[PDB]
Amino acid sequence: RPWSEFRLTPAEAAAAAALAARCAQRYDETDGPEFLLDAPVIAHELPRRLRTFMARARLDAWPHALVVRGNPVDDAALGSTPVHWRTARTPGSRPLSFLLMLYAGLLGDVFGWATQQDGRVVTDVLPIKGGEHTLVSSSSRQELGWHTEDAFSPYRADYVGLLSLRNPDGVATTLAGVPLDDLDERTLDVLFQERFLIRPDDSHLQVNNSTAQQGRVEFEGIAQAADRPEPVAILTGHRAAPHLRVDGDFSAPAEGDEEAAAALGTLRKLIDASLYELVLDQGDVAFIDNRRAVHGRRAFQPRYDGRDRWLKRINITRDLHRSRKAWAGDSRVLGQR
Amino acid sequence: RPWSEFRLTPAEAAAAAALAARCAQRYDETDGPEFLLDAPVIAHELPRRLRTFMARARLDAWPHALVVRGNPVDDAALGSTPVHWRTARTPGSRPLSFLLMLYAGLLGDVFGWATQQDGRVVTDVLPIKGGEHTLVSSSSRQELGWHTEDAFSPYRADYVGLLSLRNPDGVATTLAGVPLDDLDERTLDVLFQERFLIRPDDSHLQVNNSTAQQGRVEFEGIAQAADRPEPVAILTGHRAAPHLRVDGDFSAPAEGDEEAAAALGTLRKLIDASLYELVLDQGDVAFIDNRRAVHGRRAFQPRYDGRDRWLKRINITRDLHRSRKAWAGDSRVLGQR
Ligand SMILES: NC(=[NH2+])NCCC[C@H](N)C(=O)O
Ligand SMILES: NC(=[NH2+])NCCC[C@H](N)C(=O)O
Ligand SMILES: [Fe+2]
Ligand SMILES: [Fe+2]
């Protein structure tokens, strides 16, 4: 497969769950300063074979994601899928939120955005009634188009963690790498040049955060990024294994640049053609390499009966200090005037 | 102090030493692929209080270095200081080399250069007879001028680890941060612009590596960087806490750019004025933040009697994949044609 996969034994899965439950019993919340600081060290107590996989798989040159299968989730204990992310920090999902953060701590520094889901570090992906055909992760009936997470920002995550709390109908996450087998060298050259506009996605809009959140200054920076985007490259680094920065619905060529436009149009077609599926079943966790791959989610018919698909999500950077300009006044929650 | 300091208790120091000895007994060498992959996970077995310090101190906004005091070193067991780095992998220094790598594994991904000390990851700092007045770390009588480690390279370390095997006369390492209390905004503006040349230092020259090393292709990239340096900025990131990229002996203004020259001249004067001393006594380890601080070493009279000052050194990056263009054919040893 194009991702690296690990399956917990029942004993390993139970041990990780017990550790997460212990943390949930000793800390007030996942996003509190105390657990944010302690989690990477507590994560050292996770099963050795899992720690070995995470340390090595992160250093491999090829995988689009690190996938860990086999975390038990009891639907009765978990309770119904929340109707909105606002009310999604349910007691039943609490230990799994701690588990996600522990796993994330093995890969890097977790963080959130001042302008997304009220500045939470652990966020929620679930269908919101009335928001089926939006461009945000709470969509359903409309496919979530492929994207680099927070592509607009130089402080975007290196890894995006997704823990499936439930996914009864097996809705697929989509993934694609750089279509290096099909990009001609001229097109590749153009994609490496600063000739593209990438605007913030709709999750950073005031309407998709709680009221009175909301007037906070960090939405100014989002407005600037949308109104006056600076030209940037889509590809960076090594020509034989480039890093990728693009969003199918929020990228554009630089104004009047038809060669750049042609390169982007070609890239869209090649990514559409090479897009593949990863189904995160209940208890599966994926850490998507946000530099090597774009990701999305297939269209699905939401249930709205209390058993809708539901993920916990977390943004991870290899170096928090890279984003210090955007340390709102925290750190761990990013944004700018 | 401007650095963050931790002192091992005798029990903690002994436990860390036992772990390093265990590793030395089970692995053939520190730089072998096996220990490079395993060290970050084995490091999870280090004393908890040390792991907590390393996880937290790395995330603080202020320190120029992380300093760990109190590792025992027995001079009788260590043996005489080597006459050259080539012959410096002595049985007596072996466990301490493993210890350094374990500590480094808590902070990030270790790596070396194809063009420095024969591509070794764990390197040596000791005085070489005849090389007293050189610009390299084996100098003595001539002060080692302040510098960002490998300032010429975009793949330079985030942290530089220095473990003092011996330092009988207490020779000081020098450190300085960005002189933010004295840089006027115009000068600061200019330092943030791509108007400076930074060439590779003399440690990357063929003459300072073993013969037949030496014709290898990576020296071509070093020649290109020296002959045709691309203009780069000295300061990056947040204006209120910038990252620093400069070398007192290998930096220059862009050709004919007198405003840039004035800014560099001013910076030299301010760094010279704010330079301070850190003495790494026997058994002390420092991890210098290579983005926040420049460092050097005071002039000293070498002994050449077998008890000269001697450090083990290691380069650390928060993300190895940042340098994939320069993965010679390894990774862990960097360089380019
Ligand atoms: N092409 C897109 N739909 N981009 C936006 C992706 C979803 C966005 N990151 C969110 O959490 O809502
Ligand atoms: N200004 C300088 N002397 N720069 C070079 C610093 C020493 C070099 N990094 C070495 O290990 O030899
Ligand atoms: Fe996403
Ligand atoms: Fe140095």
Give the DSSP letter string of A211-245: TTSSSSTHHHHHHHHHHSPPPB-SEEEETTEEEE-
Which numbered atom of ligand 1 lies nearest the CA of A313?
A: 11
Q: Please report where in the chains the tokens 């790598």 appear, as a residue.
A: B101
Reduced to 3 states, what is the DSSP secondary structure of residue A199? Answer: coil
Which numbered atom of ligand 1 lies nearest the CA of A137?
A: 12
Q: Is B46 annotated as a binding residue?
A: no
Distance CA A326, CA A319 (A): 13
Distance B221 CA to ligand 2 centre (A): 18
Q: Please report where in the chains the tokens 């930096």 appear, as a residue.
A: B251
**Chain B contact set for A51 (CB, 8 A):** 41, 44
**Chain B contact set for A56 (CB, 8 A):** 37
Distance CA B103, CA B16 (A): 9
Distance A287 CA to ligand 1 centre (A): 16
What lies within 8 Å, CB to CB, of B181 at 6+ separation is: none
Out of B38, B238, B291, closest to residue A325 by CB: B238
Rg of chain A over Cα atoms, rounded to whole angstroms, equals: 19
Is residue A141 left, alpha or beta, with left meaning phi > 0 and alpha meaning psi from -120 to 50?
alpha
Q: Is B244 annotated as a binding residue?
A: no
* A77 at B interface, C-beta within 8 A: no
Instruction: Give B103→chain A minimum CA distance, Å.
Output: 14
**ω into residue A214 within 30 of 0, thus cis?**
yes
**Chain A contact set for B59 (CB, 8 A):** 37, 109, 320
Instruction: Give A44→chain B minimum CA distance, Å.
Output: 6
Method: X-ray
What lies within 8 Å, CB to CB, of B59 at 6+ separation is: A37, A109, A320
User: Are residues A265 and A257 in contact, defined by beta-carbon separation less than 8 angstroms?
Assistant: no
Q: How many CA atoms lie less than 13 Å away from B247 in the CB half-sphere? A: 20
Distance CA A305, CA A327 (A): 39
* A337 at B interface, C-beta within 8 A: no
**Chain B contact set for A37 (CB, 8 A):** 55-56, 59
Longest Cα–Cα distance of chain B, Å, equals 59
Instruction: Give B1-337's CATH code, choosing from 3.60.130.10, 3.20.20.70, 3.40.50.2000, 3.40.50.300.
Output: 3.60.130.10
Q: Please report where in the chains the tokens 């302040």 appear, as a residue.
A: B146
Give nearest CA residue, ligand 1 atom 5.
A201
The two structure tokens encoding residue A313: 């999500």
* A49 at B interface, C-beta within 8 A: no
CB pair distance less than 8 Å for B37 and A44? no
Out of B41, B237, B325, closest to residue A55 by CB: B41
The two structure tokens encoding residue A277: 């599926």
Distance A132 CA to ligand 2 centre (A): 59
Distance CA B38, CA A53 (A): 11
What lies within 8 Å, CB to CB, of A220 at 6+ separation is: A336, A337
3-state secondary structure B5-69: EEECCHHHHHHHHHHHHHHHHHCCCCCCHHHHHHHHHHHHHCCHHHHHHHHHHCCCCCCCEEEEE
**Chain B contact set for A53 (CB, 8 A):** none
Instruction: Give A37→chain B minimum CA distance, Å.
Output: 7
Q: Which amino acid is at A12?
A: E
Out of A109, A237, A322, closest to residue B325 by CB: A237
The two structure tokens encoding residue A183: 């990009």
Please tell me if the CB atom of residue A136 comes closer than 6 angstroms to any atom of ligand 1. yes
Residues making up the annotated binding site of A are 135-137, 147, 149, 173, 247-249, 295, 309, 313
Cα–Cα distance list, A198 to A20, A64, A322 (Å): 38, 22, 20
CB pair distance less than 8 Å for B320 and A59? yes
Rg of chain B over Cα atoms, rounded to whole angstroms, equals: 19
Resolution value in angstroms: 1.7
Q: Is B1 annotated as a binding residue?
A: no
Q: Residues A93, A97, A101, CA angle at the centre, nearest 5°? A: 170
* A319 at B interface, C-beta within 8 A: yes
Please tell me if the CB atom of residue A112 comes closer than 6 angstroms to any atom of ligand 1. no
> In sequence order, what are the beta bridge partners of A144?
A297
**Chain A contact set for B318 (CB, 8 A):** 318-319
Out of B41, B55, B322, closest to residue A41 by CB: B55
* A44 at B interface, C-beta within 8 A: yes
Q: Please report where in the chains the tokens 């889901």 appear, as a residue.
A: A117
Segments making up each domain of chain B, as ranges:
1-337
Question: Pocket around ligand 2: residues whose beta carbon is below 6 Å from it?
Answer: B 135-137, 144-145, 147, 149, 201, 203, 247-250
